[PDB]
Design a protein around this ligand. Structure first.
Ligand SMILES: Cc1nc(N)sc1-c1ccnc(Nc2cccc(-n3oo3)c2)n1
Length: 289
């Protein structure tokens, strides 16, 4: 398929201004995107999105300023682009690229019965492209889940990663602070309070692939503790009836990502090179159907 259209502006090195977003942007009070408001640069008319991030402490503010700093290093059509930013006493506002007619990926997944395997393959190439770019820029996402991915267009199969709240430049000995409420997306290293790295994102890629193919969450149990049990036992399978009709390649792909031990997971770059995502004679057969 066709690569996503770029932001209508060139990639910027954004630094947060002291002052009110209101002084340079008209923020919509009725159009809410996810808090995220539609907005418009007053001077130019340019249509953008405004994420008001509430910040209690200095540490909260510092987390957002890291987020800005990270977006600054990420220039790619599958990664939402920062346009401007504003800091007040109680919040930092980010102004970002706006995608007209976006649908969040948890929606796409709720409607997984719509998707052929080829549709998912194509969405997956794009998701991997975004992650491959982040990793080759030495950056970890660390929060890759359907609610953080926007389906730009269903037909063209185009996506944009739209939040970098936990993203950071790679360092050794990176331990995350985590909470076990609704933990189905957590990598086992995050659950075990171990260090995170590039494979931490690849686990999530595995999870998303499983979910697009079946509409089911691979590690969900009847409650949070039972879900944690599944993650720590790395307990999952492709025995559900949704998986009966999928290719062997698909099955091998997920098997190379849902691995408890980090170092064994394939990279983003390898994921793209994998027969599920790269094999033309397979995609052809898939189209014929
Ligand atoms: C940053 C962000 N966070 C969301 N939850 S949506 C979002 C975002 C950022 C930029 N552009 C858009 N586009 C957009 C436009 C119109 C609707 C919607 N959606 O899903 O509800 C999204 N959405």
């Amino acid at each position: 398929d066709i690569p996503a259209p770029p932001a209508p502006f060139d990639h910027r090195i954004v630094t947060a201004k002291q002052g009110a977003v209101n002084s340079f942007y008209t923020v919509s009070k009725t159009e809410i995107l996810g808090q995220v408001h539609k907005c418009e640069e007053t001077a130019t008319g340019l249509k953008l999105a405004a994420k008001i991030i509430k910040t209690r402490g200095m540490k909260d503010k510092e987390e957002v300023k890291n987020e800005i700093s990270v977006m600054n290093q990420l220039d790619h059509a599958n990664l939402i682009q920062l346009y401007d930013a504003f800091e007040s006493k109680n919040d930092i506002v980010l102004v970002m690229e706006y995608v007209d007619g976006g649908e969040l990926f948890d929606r796409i997944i709720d409607e997984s019965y719509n998707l052929t395997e080829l549709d998912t393959i194509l969405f997956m190439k794009q998701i991997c492209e975004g992650i491959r770019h982040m990793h080759q820029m030495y950056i970890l996402h660390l929060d890759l889940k359907p609610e953080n991915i926007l389906c730009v267009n269903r037909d063209a199969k185009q996506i944009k990663i739209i939040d970098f709240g936990l993203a950071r430049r790679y360092k050794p000995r990176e331990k995350l602070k985590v909470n076990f409420g609704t933990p189905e997306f957590l990598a086992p290293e995050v659950v075990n309070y171990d260090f995170v790295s590039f494979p931490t994102d690849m686990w999530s890629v595995g999870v998303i692939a499983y979910m697009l193919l079946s509409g089911l969450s691979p590690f969900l149990g009847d409650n949070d503790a039972e879900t944690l049990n599944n993650i720590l036992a790395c307990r999952w399978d492709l025995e559900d009836e949704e998986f009966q009709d999928i290719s062997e390649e698909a099955k091998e792909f997920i098997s190379k990502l849902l691995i408890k031990e980090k170092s064994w997971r394939i990279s983003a770059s390898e994921a793209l090179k994998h027969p599920w995502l790269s094999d033309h004679k397979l995609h052809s057969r898939l189209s014929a159907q």
